[model samples]
Every structure is written in C-alpha cells, then in structure tokens.
Target: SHMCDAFVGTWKLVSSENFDDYMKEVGVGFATRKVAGMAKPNMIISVNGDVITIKSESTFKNTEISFILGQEFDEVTADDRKVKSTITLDGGVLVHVQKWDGKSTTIKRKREDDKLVVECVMKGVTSTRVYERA
Candidate 1:
C-alpha cells in the first residue's frame, strides 16, 4: 500500500540502457525492436482498492494492464506477445513477472530519488530504464 502510493503517478522515460538487447532476448523482431527502442513511453500507474493499473503510452503503441497483487492474469504485451503476468510489491519495489512459451521475464520498478527506476531482466540480460516524474 505504501509502496504502491509511491508509484501512483505519471513517469516519463528519461534514459534507457541495454534495452535493445533485452528486447531481442524476448524474441522481438529487429524492425519492432528498432521502433520500440526509439519510442519514449510514459508509464502511468494507479491503484484502486486492491487493483493496480499500469499504462504504457507511446507513439508506437499503448498498452494497459490492470490486476490485483499476487494474481495471475492474461497479458498481451506491447510487442503483441501473449503471456501470463503477475505483479507484487515487496520491500517498496514492484516486481512484475511475465511467463509465456516456457520463458519468463522479470521487471522491477522502484522509486529512487524522485525518479522511477525500471529494471527489465530476460535470460541474463538486464535493461535499465529511468523515468522522471511527469
């Protein structure tokens, strides 16, 4: 609850590192990865009761997911991949896990010095995306 409060706002991407490699690990095509890598998306997070909604908005595509903590739900990712996703808050960090086709990825989001830090991990590659409050 307290941790979710810190994330309930609009965040604009300011910097990203090793994102293309992470996308590649997720099986995104070269064309799509190029487009996705160039697009800067805003992350809008909101919480209502036990349900949390995370919305990603960009010129390329807009994707939104609403789910309660610790519950598995179907998710259609921005890259058009279908997966089962779950999100949980632990130690003030929002941990999101997505599983599909026997593969899985973990995304961790946390507030750091008034900025939102998102870390996406697939296989052994990790991508860090930093966002500023918008």
Candidate 2:
C-alpha cells in the first residue's frame, strides 16, 4: 500500500527531452507532434483498490488509462492509436508495456529526488520526461 501511495498524486511535466522523436517513432503525425512539443501536460494517478488509473491532461490531447497489475487491457495512445497495454510495479518503478502493430513500447516511471521520472523506449530510441509534484 505504501508503494502504491507514492504514485497517487498530480504531476506536472517539467521536461520532455526528445519526446518529439518518440512521438514520431510511435507513428504520431506532424500536427500532433507539434502540439505535444508546445504543451506541458499534467498527469494524475489514482489508485482504487487493485486498479490504477493514469490520466494526462493537456491542450494538445488528453489520455486516460486504467489497468491492474499484470493484466492486459486495450488502450489508446495519446496520439490516438490503439494498443494492448500492461502495467506492473517493480519496487518503486512503474513499468508500462504497450503492444501495437506487432511492435512494443516500454515506459518506466519512478521517483527521483521527489520528481517523477518517466522513460519511454520504442523502435530502439528512448525518451525521458520529468514531472514535478503538483
């Protein structure tokens, strides 16, 4: 419960290092990528029982995904593409794996120095985003 408690909060994006390239590798188009680069999104994490819900809010696009540990569920990316998503927590790191078009993308989230650090990898390229408590 304590480990789950650490993930329950609102987080504001502080840095999106190389996220534009990440969106491109994931099949995001020009307009969406442009908007994403210009907006700073806020992510909210909610834990209800054994389910975890993550919501990202921004003017560019909004995304909400709910999942349970080790369970696979259908989800849509922020870029509006469909994927099969699974989430797991290993120690303090939250790992999200997405499958689409016979490919996979892995995203890892953990806390570092009171900030939420997210690392996303797809098609051999990796991007990192940092979020601060809000």
Scored against the true structure, residue 74 in model 1 reaches a CA lDDT of: 98
Best by TM-score: 1
Local accuracy of candidate 2 as per-residue lDDT tens digits, 19-117: 989888988899988987898999999999988999999988899998899999999887877999889888879999999889889999998889999
Relative to the true structure, how large is the alpha-carbon lDDT of every model? 0.95, 0.90
Off by over 4 Å in 2: none
Q: How many backbone clashes does candidate 1 have?
A: 0
Q: After superposition, how far is residue 105 of candidate 2 from its true place, in Å?
A: 0.6
Q: Write model 1 residue lDDT over 1-134, tens digit each, in one string.
A: 55579899999999999999999999999999999999999999999998899999999899999999999999999999999999988888989999999999999999899899999999999999999989
**Each model's TM-score, in the order given?**
0.97, 0.95
Clash statistics: count for each candidate = 0, 0
